[model samples]
Target chain A: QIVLTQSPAIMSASPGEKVTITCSASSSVSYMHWFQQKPGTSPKLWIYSTSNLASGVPARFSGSGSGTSYSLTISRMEAEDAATYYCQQRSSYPFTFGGGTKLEIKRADAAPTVSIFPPSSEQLTSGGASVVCFLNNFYPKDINVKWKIDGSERQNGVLNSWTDQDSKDSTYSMSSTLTLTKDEYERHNSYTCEATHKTSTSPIVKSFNRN
Target chain B: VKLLESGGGLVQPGGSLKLSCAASGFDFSRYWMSWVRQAPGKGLEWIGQINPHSSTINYTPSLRDKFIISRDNAKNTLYLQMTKVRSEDTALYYCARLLRYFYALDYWGQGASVTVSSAKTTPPSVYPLAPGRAAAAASMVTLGCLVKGYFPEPVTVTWNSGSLAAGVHTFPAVLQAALYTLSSSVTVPSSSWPSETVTCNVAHPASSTKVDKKIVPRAA
Candidate 1:
């Protein structure tokens, strides 16, 4: 049996950047195996026999090494390349994998484009209103969208976001909804959608005013 | 979707075994079908697959050399043949439809459990790592716990340091069907060293159920 150790457990690189991860084994091994596991998916063999690329794998990805030290290199990391990489030894019974290296694709900085889709006029007059704050083209998965009424913070809204390719792209979109009674929508002077991200020094606030 | 069956339930380590799956309620020839298996109390493993139309098969390199996947066109059934099965080959196997991007199993047939009798098995080897032992004292140090050579994963590796909730991450396990490997690590502040005892616990349903290793750092 062989034991494998991996380094730099966590890494972040921009798209088109080159990323290389290493795996070292305890004893000499003839060949190394490599796998990729995207979020919520099974591990896919990316490399086998040290240098042999698995079938259907992109040409940009390659593997090489011998004896105790092996490496898997991505010549140009693509957006979909953000996933965990693991190395294994096939020379002995009970093959082993090094601890995994997680690759994060750093998105280019950009603020979300915000829009408001108000409830129909008929529904607004009936008794309740549903307003949507749609956010588009945002980078980084983490974002906070809050609702404000008359320039003060308000509660009772639901927010959900989905990445462009579920992690492959830099931009994503989200929707937040504020449901209120007819009276509140008519009485409120201003309604706002405040979006904040780790990269943002201050919240990007979009407001709607009664005409 | 009904009556997916295998040739039998038990086989000797060096004998040949065959399995079959029958489906209805859909066009069996239109989709890709594959074989998956699970050892007792372990995670799922993808064996191989057959394209109904072309009869071309694809297998994970791990199992390609030992397993043969074929289809019977007349009955719209899939078959798997394995020779010289080892004890580690024992598992509950199932037939499933390959979905989107060939990355998912959408529908599954009932399981057909098989046992390959007793054989020599080895537990995982464990190790503890603390980097930069020769360097001057540092503020934060990373500790790693590696467990390798265990079979039938769903093996759990965890770290404990007296509730010092440091950054902990456990990587996914890698497998070649017969055995698997896993690793985990935690980063701690140096101030907590010497006084704190770090522990790594490994658990699996296979023989020798649990193993724990404790490490206490000394002043360098």
Candidate 2:
């Protein structure tokens, strides 16, 4: 169980300002990946698998590092680039992610608390497995959730209502239920529910298998 | 840790088979192991799982009353037993180790194939569905069909001369009197369910028979 310590959990920059975020791992790692998440949207891959910038990303953004040290550099920051950034590592058996660093943004979004609940023994209706993922205490509303079975995204046969905003506090809460077919569930497929919130440093991912 | 399943098994229908997954290179008591099966032409099925440490067990509803999954921690082996086996039970059985904390099966054993052999062939008798259910709001109706008394367990159903696979639910085969029976249903517009005396075609390759039974809705 190694920890990845990221620097300056919070940072601020002005337009046209140059910025760099560093990530240090407790042990030697194979590679480091970074994410750039803007206001009210899911985090997008900024730099990944070490030094490879994703498509459509600004050429001004670059990454370079190896072993235990990695950094993401921004040649010039724009107003649209104001968001939170995070680093993740997958060299070891159990992957790890950085806490996150917030850039210049007004009224930073409130990160939601995410948790996944497996269906009860009684909930096995029609002889299949069903699990629910909950995102609570997230502010400014709009959030997205997705289901993954053995790493492939699934988008069929579901019952989910819109996330409801709390009456008094204005914070939002959401729940999505994923039902497995009798076969997939019986076959012990690995399932994960990911919740994407704007202010969160990383997308919350919770995985489950059989009981 | 190394997880490996035992050799394949050949058991006739109506008999029982016990499958083994030997787990070594780790302490078997500290982890959980599960059993999953894949039929010849169908998807995977999780029969049950067990923790050898405290011997805690959990079974899925599909076979909760038909399976016994446990482990011999001393021998470092997990066991899955199939009781009152049927042709549908023939599959490639696999055992896996559940990683701690994360609750994922990071290790899987080489699957053990099990065949529920049969010696006789029988043709299925086709029966019309009880009645159609109509949703007035959607103007849609779902008709059902029952194909019963077959062996070696492979059949295909069609609607109105078309091989209708989508939007249909073909239930798992039920074994009785040493024969397998299953039902299927299809939902279509109410205006067309009886437009041409919809046919329920039952195709059984084992018996080389294709029975097309027509349905005329009762004076609706």
Q: Across residues B1-220, which tens digit of lDDT does each residue of candidate 1 receive?
A: 4437567454667877888888776777777787867665344455776776744777767767788988776787888887878877888777877543233345667666676754335477654544323443567655555565675445667776335444554555654346555555566777776468888887765555777777544231
Q: Which lDDT value does model 1 have at A114?
A: 55
Worst 10 residues of 2 chain B by lDDT: B129-138
Residues B36-61, candidate 2, lDDT per residue (tens digit)? 67665343345665765645677656
Worst 10 residues of 2 chain A by lDDT: A161-170
Interface RMSD of 2: 18.5
Best by TM-score: 1
Once superposed on the true structure, which residue ranges of model 1 sit more than 4 Å away at CA? A1-11, A22-32, A35-45, A56-60, A64-71, A78-107, A120-129, A140-142, A164-169, A178-189, A197-202, A209-211, B1-220
C-alpha lDDT (0 to 100) for residue A168 of candidate 2: 32
User: What are the per-model C-alpha RMSD values against the true structure?
Assistant: 22.6, 19.8
Q: What DockQ does each candidate score versus the true complex, computed on alpha carbons?
A: 0.01, 0.02
Model 2 CAPRI quality? incorrect
